[PDB]
């Protein structure tokens, strides 16, 4: 809190203030009251008498960045540490911003957490003088320290759930393939659960959708029209999963018995299906502590070894699959 | 853009930006190179040489709230006023600054609404100079201006179509009962519809939810309780409504079949369940709009006649009715 601080909220010059501050008889006296009072209420005092990290993710309002907030938030506490948060609505050009907006305020470090993380924003990441590490976010550069899940392995074990149960023709219906997320990790992971069992890599069992639900609508639709029709599917967003759940239950399909699907993210909307909808969970909670601990570890010029965090992740087995 | 701006933006004093805008020779060179790029880029003149709404909406992103700001835009541009937004997250002690910091920034008029509109931001409605009126929002108290749908109505043409298709057992599950949108409007809507068709009005066929999607599963659940089970329900909102449609899925229902369901609000929601959920559609566009045209009226001090204004709403009949 200072002078320009108590300016701002007394819509008033830092002359003003000071102005008032050293008790200048001339200030109009309502002007006067109105800065004293903003003095008192801010807790300014005139008489010259630690450690933040800035975080940047979409929003405060879902439920798996609040775990994720939670997470940082203990962290910050017992480390006495404080908290300057940024609710973005991941864009490139206004999370960059928010991004420089933290530089511009004095944080000692960044907590970083996007679903599309661009190539532009590394090369403005190390430029950044203070350490940066992203939470459940990948840079398939891996220069900047992440700590997530292995998207890979979950990606991996969601298949493999399908493939235990049966399934030999099993599809994936994707978010944008030009993300990291999708074609290094949950592609490959989809496509090392098939191969290990022997099963077959189409190309035509991979659709592409924008993690709309009615994207998830038409990658149904489109897998349902393939010659030998997939019986399971797994889908990179729970969102696009409901879209690929009632495509099926549209074209008469049931699930899980006709059809079974798997999701990612554990969100609110996978328990507002019917069938509730099995979906990879990750664990944003710790994601955050841990995140906020490699970030303390950088901060504190500690040796790190190695940079690229992976927690586990499980599954929350619903009624999606039999 | 001002002095003021332009300080802001080059991270600078206004001092320092006259300093510059003087040509001021002791300026360091870098931080003149800042400055008249910041001039530059903001458009500042250095040489002195319109109407504008303020518009407080719950969130930018909300699709409903997307085709109202939309109406509001439109209206704005061809009467070439310009539009501050700001996306609010409605609550009581938030949406009140940012009501007073329009106030600050000195707008013309003021576009507000908000789900809750609480008694104690009527008090400082009045006392605001500039004029207010609310959009898709209603204060029982009915003096400030407010552009609407009749929910009264359209709550009773909601439970019409359940007694019109053969439902003497008909139960509404509420948002909060406290705010007039539902003890005010949609109760007294259902209760009408069903008096005028000589059916009984039974306290315990009304259930309060919390606009949750799981107070929704829970009042489905008492209402599959009681005695005489209702065999149609009418919900105050959408996000109830899916928990409606499940918690009876879950019982073992048929939505239409055993049970019809129909929502309010035709949000993304009503497409993201199956059956799809009938729904009673607002016209945000037109209420945006409208609420622009008749806030542009009292900031033209012309003579309203009719300060509450009442628009059409329809019914979106999908599958959870018959
Ligand atoms: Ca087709
Ligand atoms: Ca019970």
Redo the contacts between chains.
Sequence with gaps: VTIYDVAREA?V??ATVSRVVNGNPNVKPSTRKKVLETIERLGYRPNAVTTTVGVIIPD??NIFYAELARGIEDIASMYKYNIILSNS?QNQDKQLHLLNNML?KQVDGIIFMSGNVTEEHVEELKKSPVPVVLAASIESTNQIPSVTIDYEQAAFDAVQSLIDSGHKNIAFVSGTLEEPINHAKKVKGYKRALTESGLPVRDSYIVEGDYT?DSGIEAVEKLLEEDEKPTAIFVGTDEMA?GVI?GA??RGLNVPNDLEIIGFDNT?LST???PQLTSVVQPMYDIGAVAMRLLTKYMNKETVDSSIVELPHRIEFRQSTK
Tied chains: 1, 2.
Excluded: E
Aim: no cysteine; charged share 25%.
């Design positions: 819509s010059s830092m405060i309002s609505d511009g639900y409901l009632h239950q549209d609110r507002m299906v019917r």
